[PDB]
Amino acid sequence: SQTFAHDSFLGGLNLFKRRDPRFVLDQGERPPYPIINSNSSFVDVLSNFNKADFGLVLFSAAIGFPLSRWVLKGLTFSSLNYRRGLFSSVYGGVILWGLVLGFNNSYYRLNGFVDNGLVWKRKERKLNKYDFTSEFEDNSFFKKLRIRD
Amino acid sequence: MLTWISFWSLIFWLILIILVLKPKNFISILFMSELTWLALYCLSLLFGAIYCDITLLSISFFILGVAGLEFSFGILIAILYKNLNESLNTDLNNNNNNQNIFDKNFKTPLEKINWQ
Amino acid sequence: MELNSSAKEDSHYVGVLGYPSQHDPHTLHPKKHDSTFTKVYACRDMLWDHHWEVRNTLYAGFKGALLGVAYASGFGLISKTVPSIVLKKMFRFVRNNNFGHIRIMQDLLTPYALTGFGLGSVYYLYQHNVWENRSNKWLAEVLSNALFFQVATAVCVNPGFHIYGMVGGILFGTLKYAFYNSSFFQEKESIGSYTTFGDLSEEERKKQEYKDYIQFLGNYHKVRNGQLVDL
Amino acid sequence: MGDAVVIHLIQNVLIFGIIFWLLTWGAEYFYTVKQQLTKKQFYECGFKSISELNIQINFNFFMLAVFLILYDVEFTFLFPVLFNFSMFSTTELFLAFFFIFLILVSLLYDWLNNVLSWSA
Amino acid sequence: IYDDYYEGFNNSIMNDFTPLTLSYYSINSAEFIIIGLLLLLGSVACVNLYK
Amino acid sequence: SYSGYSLNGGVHPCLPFYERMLQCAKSEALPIKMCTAQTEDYLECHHRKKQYALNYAIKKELNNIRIVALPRYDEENDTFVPFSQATADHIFQ
Amino acid sequence: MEFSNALLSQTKLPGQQYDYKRCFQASNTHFECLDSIRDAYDNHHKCPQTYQAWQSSCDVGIRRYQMDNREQQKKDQLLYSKEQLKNYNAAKNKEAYGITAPKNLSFAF
Amino acid sequence: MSIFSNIWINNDLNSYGLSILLLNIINYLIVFMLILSVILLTNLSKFKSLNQFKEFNSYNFILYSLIFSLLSMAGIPPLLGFTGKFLAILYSSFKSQYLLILFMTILNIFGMYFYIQNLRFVVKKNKSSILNYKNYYVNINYSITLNIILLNFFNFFGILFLSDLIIILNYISSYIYI
Amino acid sequence: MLLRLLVSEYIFFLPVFTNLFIYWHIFFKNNINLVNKKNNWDKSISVKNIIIKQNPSFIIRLNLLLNSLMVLYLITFNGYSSTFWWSHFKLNNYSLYMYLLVIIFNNYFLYITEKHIKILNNYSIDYFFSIINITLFIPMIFLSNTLFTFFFLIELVSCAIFYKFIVSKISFKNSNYKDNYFSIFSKNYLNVLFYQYWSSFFSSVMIGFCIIYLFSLTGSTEWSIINFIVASNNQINYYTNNITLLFICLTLIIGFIIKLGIAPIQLYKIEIYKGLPFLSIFFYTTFYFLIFFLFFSLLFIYYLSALNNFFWIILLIISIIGIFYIISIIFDINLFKAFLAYSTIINSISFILLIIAIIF
């Protein structure tokens, strides 16, 4: 299945495209994409920041406003100053979560867990022996969520 | 006369027994809890020295921190006994008779049971 | 952690593997050059004789007495209420005697220790002489325990509480057959393990195992009923 | 931390106290004490005290005591990194600064709720 | 009686806090941070219990 | 949770045994059956049970009257001479 | 848990890290050599230099997982094929859209 | 676990028991939310003693939700609480534990009477007043009512959809050793 | 480490710290919500209200939002099955699925709790902040790769639960006007605090002793190393002192029995339940069954499966004693919260029997 091109502003949407429902890979299992830096440091991940991570931050900022308003909808007995301060703190928290998501995306691109514009020389040959999802996804919305069907 | 491993395990369980053995006064139980934590502290130090493990020596300060937190909570709970009209000697907070107490005698707050 | 290890032992499998056998003789054979003290001290092997019925009865009584003493120490003595005057007299005795606590414990634990010893000895004799030749082992265990515990509760707790004693004996017999008589959670050999004899050729054994596998394929409901799609 | 020599010095301190005791007894030779009604009674500025054993305090600073326990524990935890700070790395530096930040946060929360003062 | 003089002259440690540092700040640092959070939350709970 | 450090900040005396045991366990398909030697070496380094059994046997044998006098030693030649030999610095001269 | 090769491989020494990029480079080279040979059994001695590089770069647990996965892949490739599996799964789903009536009055066993 | 000419045949799933345990815990949590969602919908101070199950005698929704939650807790089929006990007994039989089955049955029957004993207390001489008053009228929370509706659907007809939950839990438990 | 500090050692720790900082920033700024200085040049459109009782609906909504963000992080999570931060935590599929399941159930219960709190406000901000702290750290237990880190995580969770029990409302506004000039003595609060504190103390000291003696037995407390050493010992027959292994198993099991309040030690649980609000019972049951009892079972199933040769007999004895001890007691209670607690206890014993069948 196709993924949004990395280093664009929709590269963070590739985090929602998973070929298997597994959380993590095995110890000796090769990642889907070539490894750029397995021994990544914090500044290596920061240097690997790009438009995909910036777009993740922008998505957090855009969706964080209604979420902060929804949180504030339960606030009572509060002055305007405290209401504004609480909104600012919640919105900053959501934007910080977006920054964390962008950092995770950069780290994954470094480790090859998600798309990083690189492909292995020889792809892993897998036989889809057990297949309950191909026909379901080819006629539904979920073909956009599973990589390689 | 006993080896230190035997002595320290034995007296840790002896402290746990004595804590139950003594009358259930909250301050006394708090003191025995501190003593139990110190026994664990010494036993961890002994095993760390024997097996050359720095992780067992690490539990020395961790046990101190846990014991300090529990002691602070116990101090607060002991203070709380004052506002709930609860005796520190918890054996006096129930009407069940026991021969362990010389003077336990609780009576209804009434003068006369029968009016003529 | 095992129960009744010596009785629950596949002697054939243990011998084939070369594993030590608990049924091997545990005895001492002095030579005719040893001292008289060596001859006498070698007679302690009689205490290791599991076929000595007097020793077995004594040790079963000792185990029952230990259980009774433990019950008195933990659940029995503290439950019952001693009169205050009796306690005062006992503590006065402790005051005026150098080891009065030992005497107090002797007096308090004596009924429980004696009851445990008697129950253990009678139970061992009952099981060994009445029910060791029955075919249905589970049924024999259940019936024997039911009757024994009904009689015991009719005389140790209260005669009115004998139905509950019979039910508890049934449950205890089921538990004893499940774990003390059966190798559950105490398996000494792998499930499906076997030993080979006859000096059969490896080709012949492979052919026999192929035949067994062909028969094994009939245990699948899809294979037996012919409900498989063409793969 | 000392040793059996410290224990022996404690014994010698006890012997020095014995010397002071001898001097005090010798001084006791030089006076007479006359028995009087209120001589061996409690002093309360010239009048009899109305209480002997039941002299109870209010203890309004139990929060300060429990915070003292917790923060003494925290300072003990801070001791090792400061003892060997010359070998600090990124991890050790981050942990030390985060621990000090947690101590400061706990103190500030204690200040916000007015639990560091006396109560009625 | 055995003394390793090579390790002795290659050792610059001058205090007995080295295992404590290696524990609370290298390997058991997770439990060090956990104990810090525990003490913070315990202080908060102590304030709430006083209230 | 194996630190690998000694009480002076150095290296734990059983770290090579632990490393070899872990290497065998990761390499073998049946680590329990195959890493018995390395695991037993690590367990002997940790629990010195074999040395304690040796000490028990040595104490039992010293309770007997088999050995009277051990050979004395001199460092100048780095050698052991019999107790019966009248050398310098001897206890009995 | 003690019998789990994966859980034992996840264990590691303190301070032990895996250079996954180098490990997978060596693994790709060695497995490319092995697949070029294309034998029923993986004779690592027929690709000597790449075998040494794979041993040095990769850890024991990583190599154990790689060999187990290679054995599974070889078995699957000897057994199945893509179009056959696709047709089989399509037929299985189509049958799952129905019921399994019992085979009353059978002729076997 | 059989072997034929050095080839192992494995007809047993090792991770099935953990899935059954997870299903039992999840079913208990779902039924516990169902009983306590009805409680949180009402005046919480009205339920002090066991005889005060009469307080649930109100408009039919609260009454029937309470009685069906109690029946589900007791393990009465086909309610959600029955499925967990049935699967536990099935797995114990698969593991060949007749004594464990016997003790599970004893505990199940005693607890079942423990739960259904309170169904007698629900009978009240009149309809109860257990709702909080907001704006002079009883406060009925539609959100909690909808939650109870969903829980009641999955408690009544949850046996029809239990296969998917079993698949999910077995899939989750299959990662424990691989 | 020394030279390089890889991201893979704290990449999972980053979102947890982010949530912690957001939560505590909100909590700290909430404590000064009423401090808004009016300068001499400021005109008040309305007279300031100085009596405030803020509905904690916004706190619950913040908890839901941050738990949902953690769910989102878990959904997009990637990595290798390995141990991070000096092998004190494990990142594997089962542990991450347990984390996700715990967070999902916490989200459901928090949503229902918000819907309830909009009806009547009998709870404060501090109560839901304690709940916030529980939900943040209670899933971290399943990530423990060591009994040491597990012990410290459950110490933090127990402190949070004690905090939650502390902030329960004591006095209410009721239509009982007959008690205004008389002293009524309610002792449920002190009973709850006392029993929770002492059960926590006993469980903590027993778990500490078990950790100390497991370090002696193995030299490490990592789950994989403990299981490997114990299983190989059954193959080498090196450490044959069955007394020590049996006592370690007994200490661990009894400490967990005291912690969980499983029969025959359940009267303290009965006393605690009948002194807590129904919302507190809601959350406490959610945390107990999904986390504490689940880790109990996984200790007998996954973490210490190599010790099942000693676990089975202790578990069987405890199950039999509990079954034959509570059958009479469950029929002499007359309280709603006692009924709920005994329902929990009965289900716990049933699941203990189930795990006994599992470890077979």
Ligand SMILES: CCCCCCCCCCCCCCCCCC(=O)OC[C@H](COP(=O)(O)OCCN)OC(=O)CCCCCCCCCCCCCCCCC
């Ligand atoms: C033709 C069509 C045209 C278009 C039609 C219209 C549009 C259609 C839109 C379709 C839907 C779009 C969905 C968009 C993304 C949604 C993401 C989501 O919901 O994820 C759920 C999550 C994903 O699971 P997974 O990825 O496997 O987990 C992480 C693994 N690394 O899964 C999980 O978190 C699983 C958690 C498992 C553990 C908990 C659950 C099992 C146990 C409890 C059972 C239930 C009991 C109650 C629990 C509480 C319920 C509130």
